[PDB]
């Protein structure tokens, strides 16, 4: 997980790390959450407006 984080550039949260039991699951998570935001910066999650569409 540390290696994955280092290569990625991004931080996978502690709870997520605890949950995900396989490399495949980790990959799937990454594809879901970080990737789309990385692709499109307007699509990214903002803190002050968490319920944005």
């Amino acid at each position: 997980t540390k290696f994955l984080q280092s290569k990625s550039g991004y931080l996978i949260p502690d709870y997520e790390l605890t949950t995900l039991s396989t490399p495949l699951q980790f990959k799937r998570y990454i594809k879901e959450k970080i990737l789309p935001s990385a692709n499109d910066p307007k699509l990214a999650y903002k803190e002050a407006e968490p319920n944005a569409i």
């Binding site: 709870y15 605890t18 949950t19 995900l20 039991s21």
Partner: protein, 106 residues
């Protein structure tokens, strides 16, 4: 004795997101002194008796359904599961029966 154990002794199944505890399963933790958390409560000035069941982890609906299956003599209507605190209220003083049902597993 130690609050956080070492990394070696902790197994994988002990961690969160393992063994599928969220999906359609539950637990009912005993009190500090070591008894089943099932209590009579005399509401509305002693007029309304109700049996409360506390300290439920996981799916409360499933637990309620299981208890109904165990105790068919209590009606279906009288099983109010309050979701905010996760406790399941029954109309009568049905404490002893509930305890009997739970004891075997919890």
């Amino acid at each position: 004795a130690p609050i956080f154990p070492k990394l070696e002794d902790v197994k994988m199944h002990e961690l969160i997101g393992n063994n599928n505890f969220g999906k359609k399963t539950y637990y009912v933790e005993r009190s500090r002194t070591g008894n089943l958390p099932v209590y009579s409560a005399y509401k509305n000035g002693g007029n309304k008796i109700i049996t409360e069941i506390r300290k439920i982890e996981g799916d409360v609906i499933q637990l309620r359904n299981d208890l109904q299956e165990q105790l068919p003599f209590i009606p279906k209507k009288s099983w109010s599961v309050v979701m905010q605190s996760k406790k399941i209220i029954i109309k009568g003083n049905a404490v002893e029966a509930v305890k009997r049902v739970l004891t075997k597993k919890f």
